[PDB]
Design a protein around this ligand. Structure first.
Ligand code: HEC
Length: 104
């Protein structure tokens, strides 16, 4: 995916609730640094719902593609309030951004 486009998508749709950098603050949602290859509900120091803690999947390209299409369908009872991104390209770009930004 296109990392620059993904950043713009992140800023538009995600950044008000999430930081990405190492040591970034939790906000309404958790800081996302280190997400890739991590199980659900494992950012330190954040009160997740039991639903997000209990989902039990490993975050990566395949599971983010599904989740981001419709978060509440993938994790029913999540307190993340975001309807989803319908477009496959847009999700791929966003994921490519996340794979860089969350690992820097
Ligand atoms: C606030 C209004 C949010 C917006 C907009 C987005 N997210 Fe979010 N996210 C938010 C909360 C409160 C939580 C925790 C949910 C729970 O039920 O405890 C989350 C969680 C996620 C996660 C899972 C993190 C993990 O398992 O460690 C991911 C991967 C995630 N959020 C990503 C994400 C992206 C990419 C968004 C824009 C498309 C986005 N979120 C929007 C709150 C909010």
């Amino acid at each position: 995916g296109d990392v620059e486009k993904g950043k713009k998508i992140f800023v538009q749709k995600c950044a008000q609730c999430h930081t990405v950098e190492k040591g970034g603050k939790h906000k309404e949602g958790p800081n996302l640094h280190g997400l890739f290859g991590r199980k659900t509900g494992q950012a330190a120091g954040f009160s997740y719902t039991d639903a997000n803690k209990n989902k039990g999947i490993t975050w990566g390209e395949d599971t983010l593609m599904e989740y981001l299409e419709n978060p509440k369908k993938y994790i029913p009872g999540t307190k993340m309030i975001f309807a989803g991104i319908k477009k496959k390209g847009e999700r791929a770009d966003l994921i490519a951004y996340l794979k860089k930004a969350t690992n820097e």
